[PDB]
From Swiss-Prot:
Gene3D superfamilies: 3.30.60.30. Glycans are attached at residue 43. Disulfide bonds join 6-36, 14-33, 22-54. Its main location: secreted. Transmembrane segments: none annotated. The keyword Secreted applies. InterPro entries: Bifunctional_prot_inhibitor, Kazal_dom, Kazal_dom_sf, Prot_inh_Kazal-m. One of its GO terms (molecular function) is serine-type endopeptidase inhibitor activity. This is Ovomucoid. GO terms for cellular component: extracellular space. SUPFAM superfamilies: Kazal-type serine protease inhibitors.
Length: 54
């Protein structure tokens, strides 16, 4: 649905912008900072699904 550019953007210490995204990981996300962080540990096998509680 949307393309994100995080060429090496591991940041699992964000805590401010609240945004419940439906990530392809089968769950919601706390923000795009947690989306690019889970992707750094997913090996690029994680994505988005539809902004909003899955």
């Amino acid at each position: 649905a949307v393309s994100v550019d995080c060429s090496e953007y591991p940041k699992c210490a964000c805590t401010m912008e609240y945004r419940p995204l439906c990530g392809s990981d089968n769950k919601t996300y706390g923000n795009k900072c947690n989306f690019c962080c889970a992707v750094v540990e997913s090996n690029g096998t994680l994505t988005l699904s539809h902004f909003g509680k899955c």
